[PDB]
C-alpha cells in the first residue's frame with residue numbers, strides 16, 4: 001500500500017496483529033537532515049522527492065550517549081537506542097489500522113530520556129497494538145537530544161536553543177498537512193509522552209506556535225515545572241562556554257564558536273557534554289529546554305501561574321516509585337543486586353548526591369520531613385525515604401502542582417496513580433513501581449498473550465488502553481462498559497485521582513499532601 005504525501009509517495013509494510021492487520025510506515029523523513037551548516041539550527045523544510053520513499057524499517061536514532069552502568073542487563077538496555085546513531089535522524093513513524101480508517105483520532109508519542117537520550121524505535125513504543133485494538137492512528141518522531149538538540153546562545157539563530165522541541169513541532173506540523181491522506185483526523189490529535197517526553201508535551205501547551213497542532217494532552221511522569229525540566233539562561237550560557245572550552249572552540253565572535261563546534265565530529269561533542277555541568281546528578285539535564293524567546297516567550301512557571309496556555313483537557317499521572325530507578329545510578333549503599341538497606345549516614349550522603357548545590361540547612365530539612373518514622377525500627381526506613389525524596393521532588397509533586405494550576409483555568413483534568421509492578425520487570429523488588437514501567441501497559445504489550453504477562457496484566461492494560469483512547473477521542477477517559485470505576489475530574493479543592501492496579505481501582509484524594517507541601521511551598525525558599 002502506497003500513500004501520496006505532500007512531498008511524495010511513501011511505501012508501507014503490513015503487520016499481522018491479533019488475527020488482523022496494521023499498516024506501518026516506519027522512518028518517514030520530516031525535515032532536511034540537520035547536518036553541516038545546519039547543525040544546531042532549527043529544523044528546515046523538506047524538498048519534494050519524486051520516487052517512492054521506502055518507509056519499511058525504523059530510521060537512524062539521533063546521536064546520544066549510551067547508559068553503560070549495567071552492560072547486558074535488560075532493565076537498562078531496553079532504553080538504549082536500537083538503530084544506528086546518526087545526526088541524520090529527523091524521521092517519524094505512522095501506524096494506521098487496516099482496513100484504512102475514515103477519520104481516526106491520532107495519537108502522537110514524544111519519548112523521554114532526560115532530553116539527552118531516547119528514540120521512537122524502542123520496543124515499548126510499538127504503536128501497532130494501539131492501532132489494532134482501538135483503531136487510532138499512532139505517530140512517533142525522533143528529535144535531537146543533548147547539546148545537538150538544545151545547545152543555547154539566546155538570540156543567536158546559529159544555536160538558538162530548543163531545536164529538539166522545534167523538531168517535535170515540525171513533526172506535529174507534518175501530521176496536520178499529511179495525516180488525512182492516511183485516514184487520520186488532523187482535528188483530533190492527542191499528544192502523549194513520558195518523563196522528558198511528558199515535559200515536552202506540557203511545553204507544547206505553553207508554546208503559541210503549537211496551539212493549532214493538537215487537541216488534547218496526556219502527561220506520564222513528567223511536566224515542565226519539574227526541577228530538571230528547564231535550563232536557565234544563566235546555566236545554558238555557562239554550559240555552552242564550557243563546551244567551547246572543552247573542544248578548543250573558545251572564540252569571541254559568538255558565531256565563530258558555532259562554526260568551530262560545527263567542524264567537530266559528533267563523537268567529540270558527546271564526550272564533552274558530561275563535564276559541562278560542574279556537579280552532575282543522576283537526573284542532570286546538561287542541555288535541555290530554555291527560555292529562547294521563540295518556542296518559549298517567558299519563564300514557564302509564570303505562564304502556568306497566569307493562565308497563558310492552551311485551553312483543553314489534560315490527562316496527568318505518576319507512578320508509585322518514581323524515585324528508585326535513580327538511587328542505583330549514584331547513591332551510596334544502593335545496588336540492584338541486593339536489598340540496599342542503608343544507614344542514616346548513607347541516606348545523608350545520598351542527599352549530597354541528589355542535592356549537590358543545596359545548603360547544609362536545606363539538606364537537614366529534607367532529612368527532617370522524611371525521617372519521622374511511622375516505625376523507627378524498620379531497616380528499610382532510609383532506603384525507602386531516599387527513593388520517596390527523589391520521586392516526590394522530581395516527579396510526583398511537580399505533576400500535582402501542574403494539574404492544580406492548569407485546572408484552575410476551567411479545563412477538565414484527570415489524574416492517575418499507577419501502582420502495578422510489571423510481572424516481567426527485571427529490576428529487583430525493592431525498587432517497586434519504577435519510573436517508566438507504566439509505558440508497557442499504555443502501549444498494550446500485555447495484550448500479547450505470547451509474552452509472560454499474567455491475565456491480570458492483560459486486563460489492566462486492556463482498560464488503560466481503552467481509557468487513553470477514549471480520552472484522545474472524546475476527552476473523557478472512562479471505560480463505559482465493563483462496569484469500571486468512573487474516573488472523576490481533578491478539581492483543585494477535592495483533588496480526586498484514580499489508582500490503576502490489577503486488584504481494585506479506587507478514587508482517592510490529595511495524593512502525597514504532606515510531602516508536596518514541603519517541596520512546593522517550603523523547599524523553594526532555600
Ligand SMILES: *[C@@H]1O[C@H](CO[C@@H]2O[C@@H](C)[C@@H](O)[C@@H](O)[C@@H]2O)[C@@H](O[C@@H]2O[C@H](CO)[C@@H](O)[C@H](O)[C@H]2NC(C)=O)[C@H](O)[C@H]1NC(C)=O
Nearest residue numbers: 102103104105180183184185186187188189215473474475
Ligand atoms: C473528519 O471529522 C471532522 C470532524 O471531527 C471533529 O473534529 C473536532 C471538532 C473534534 O473536537 C471532534 O468534535 C470531532 O472528531 C470533519 O470536519 C469537518 O471539516 C469541514 C471541512 O473539511 C468543516 O467545514 C466542518 O466544519 C468540519 N466539521 C466539524 C464538526 O468540525 C470532517 O468532515 C471529517 N472528514 C471525513 C469524515 O472524511
Ligand SMILES: *[C@@H]1O[C@H](CO[C@@H]2O[C@@H](C)[C@@H](O)[C@@H](O)[C@@H]2O)[C@@H](O[C@@H]2O[C@H](CO)[C@@H](O)[C@H](O)[C@H]2NC(C)=O)[C@H](O)[C@H]1NC(C)=O
Nearest residue numbers: 235237238239241242243244245246274275276277278279
Ligand atoms: C561555570 O563555569 C565555570 C568553569 O567550569 C569549569 O570548566 C569546564 C570546562 C568544566 O570542566 C567544569 O567542570 C569546570 O568546573 C565553573 O567554575 C569552576 O568551578 C570548579 C568547582 O566548582 C573549580 O574547580 C574550577 O576551577 C572553576 N573554574 C572556573 C574557570 O571558574 C563554575 O562553577 C560554573 N558554574 C557557576 C555557577 O559559576
Ligand SMILES: *[C@@H]1O[C@H](CO[C@@H]2O[C@@H](C)[C@@H](O)[C@@H](O)[C@@H]2O)[C@@H](O[C@@H]2O[C@H](CO)[C@@H](O)[C@H](O)[C@H]2NC(C)=O)[C@H](O)[C@H]1NC(C)=O
Nearest residue numbers: 328330331332333334335336337338339340341342343346
Ligand atoms: C549492596 O551492594 C553495595 C554495592 O557494592 C557492590 O555490590 C555488591 C552486591 C558486591 O558485589 C560489592 O562487591 C560491590 O562493590 C554495597 O555497598 C558497599 O559496601 C561496602 C561496605 O559496606 C563499601 O566499602 C563499598 O564502598 C560499598 N559500595 C558502594 C557504596 O558502591 C552494600 O553494602 C550492599 N548492601 C547489602 C545490604 O548487601
Ligand SMILES: O[C@H](CNCC1CC1)[C@H](Cc1ccccc1)NC1c2ccccc2-c2ccccc21
Nearest residue numbers: 067079113114116117195282283284325329435436
Ligand atoms: O538512564 C537514565 C537514568 N538517569 C541516570 C543518568 C546517568 C544516565 C534514564 C534511562 C532509564 C534507566 C532505568 C529505568 C528507566 C529509564 N533516562 C534519563 C536520562 C539520561 C541521561 C541524562 C539524564 C537523564 C534523565 C533525567 C530525569 C529523568 C529521566 C532521565
Ligand SMILES: *[C@@H]1O[C@H](CO[C@@H]2O[C@@H](C)[C@@H](O)[C@@H](O)[C@@H]2O)[C@@H](O)[C@H](O)[C@H]1NC(C)=O
Nearest residue numbers: 010011012013014051052053054055056057
Ligand atoms: C523500495 O522497495 C521496492 C519494493 O521492495 C519490496 O519490499 C522491500 C521491503 C524488499 O523486501 C523488496 O525485496 C520488495 O520488492 C523496491 O522494488 C525498490 O527497489 C526499493 N527502492 C529503494 C530506493 O530502496
Ligand SMILES: CC(=O)N[C@H]1[C@H]([C@H](O)[C@H](O)CO)O[C@@](O)(C(=O)O)C[C@@H]1O
Nearest residue numbers: 073075335336337338425426427428429
Ligand atoms: C547479578 C544477577 O543477575 N542477579 C540475580 C538477578 C538480579 O539481581 C535481579 O533480577 C535484579 O537485578 O535476579 C535473580 O535473583 C532473580 O530473582 O531472578 C537471579 C540473578 O542471580
Ligand SMILES: *[C@@H]1O[C@H](CO)[C@@H](O)[C@H](O)[C@H]1NC(C)=O
Nearest residue numbers: 251252253254255256257259
Ligand atoms: C563577527 O560578529 C559579527 C556580529 O558582532 C557578525 O556580523 C560577523 O559575521 C562575525 N564574523 C564572521 C566572520 O561571521
Ligand SMILES: *[C@@H]1O[C@H](CO)[C@@H](O)[C@H](O)[C@H]1NC(C)=O
Nearest residue numbers: 459462463466479480481482
Ligand atoms: C470487557 O470484558 C470482556 C470479557 O468479558 C473482554 O473481552 C473485553 O476486552 C473487556 N473490555 C474492556 C474495555 O476491558
